[PDB]
Design a protein around this motif. Structure first.
Motif, mmCIF file in Angstrom:
data_model
loop_
_atom_site.group_PDB
_atom_site.id
_atom_site.type_symbol
_atom_site.label_atom_id
_atom_site.label_comp_id
_atom_site.label_asym_id
_atom_site.label_seq_id
_atom_site.Cartn_x
_atom_site.Cartn_y
_atom_site.Cartn_z
ATOM 1 N N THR A 40 -7.088 -4.351 0.100
ATOM 2 C CA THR A 40 -6.549 -3.057 -0.366
ATOM 3 C C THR A 40 -6.222 -3.084 1.480
ATOM 4 O OG1 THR A 40 -7.736 -1.798 -1.016
ATOM 5 C CG2 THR A 40 -6.252 -3.122 -2.253
ATOM 6 N N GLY A 54 -1.494 -3.531 3.715
ATOM 7 C CA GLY A 54 -2.176 -3.744 2.184
ATOM 8 C C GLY A 54 -1.804 -5.039 1.801
ATOM 9 N N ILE A 58 2.897 -5.620 3.466
ATOM 10 C CA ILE A 58 4.498 -5.433 3.777
ATOM 11 C C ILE A 58 3.965 -4.437 4.941
ATOM 12 C CG2 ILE A 58 5.680 -3.205 2.966
ATOM 13 C CD1 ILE A 58 4.190 -3.820 -0.041
ATOM 14 N N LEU A 83 -0.086 2.450 1.812
ATOM 15 C CA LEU A 83 -0.533 0.815 1.129
ATOM 16 C C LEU A 83 -2.251 -0.027 1.102
ATOM 17 C CD1 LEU A 83 2.855 -0.264 2.791
ATOM 18 C CD2 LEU A 83 2.686 -0.109 0.428
ATOM 19 N N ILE A 88 -3.344 0.160 -6.261
ATOM 20 C CA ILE A 88 -2.230 -0.784 -6.173
ATOM 21 C C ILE A 88 -0.517 -0.261 -6.324
ATOM 22 C CG2 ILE A 88 -3.752 -2.618 -5.641
ATOM 23 C CD1 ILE A 88 -1.935 -4.206 -7.697
ATOM 24 N N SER A 91 1.648 -0.123 -3.799
ATOM 25 C CA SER A 91 2.393 -1.923 -2.617
ATOM 26 C C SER A 91 3.318 -2.298 -4.235
ATOM 27 C CB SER A 91 1.331 -2.146 -2.430
ATOM 28 O OG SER A 91 0.281 -2.029 -1.443
#
Ligand SMILES: [Cl-]
Ligand code: NA
Length: 129
Positions: A40, A54, A58, A83, A88, A91
């Motif tokens: 992460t 992440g 992204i 993110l 999560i 994300s």
């Protein structure tokens, strides 16, 4: 947080990614492996000055605000740091918007080059859901 493979597969399934826009869970797990190694906290700078964040890398060029990508958009309406959470949710919800934008999972270069047209079911083999 560095996820295990089946731990991430279960978290992605609980957040609604299994067959999301027709992409089986193994596609999402394969994308995360080659984008972030299931970490992460992964960050990587792009040539244009944007940064990827992440478990699904992204990009701040379009999706999030990191305070240092001039002339960019924030289409997911989130700080990029959201993110990097062990949770999560941010994300996954931003990935649902990306995969709906016209290019599907081709938005993820690692997915197109390492996962697309492979036996992606292998990534969820042995996992309890
Ligand atoms: Cl698609
Ligand atoms: Na941005």
């Amino acid at each position: 947080k560095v996820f295990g493979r089946c731990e991430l597969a279960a978290a992605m399934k609980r957040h609604g990614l299994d067959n999301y826009r027709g992409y089986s869970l193994g596609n999402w797990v394969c994308a995360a492996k080659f984008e972030s190694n299931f970490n992460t906290q992964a960050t990587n700078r792009n040539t244009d000055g944007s940064t990827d964040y992440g478990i699904l890398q992204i990009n701040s060029r379009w999706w999030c605000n990191d305070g240092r990508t001039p002339g960019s958009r924030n289409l997911c309406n989130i700080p990029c740091s959201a993110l990097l959470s062990s949770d999560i949710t941010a994300s996954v919800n931003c990935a649902k918007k990306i995969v709906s934008d016209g290019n599907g999972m081709n938005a993820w270069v690692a997915w197109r080059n390492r996962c697309k047209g492979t036996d992606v079911q292998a990534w969820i083999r042995g996992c309890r859901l």
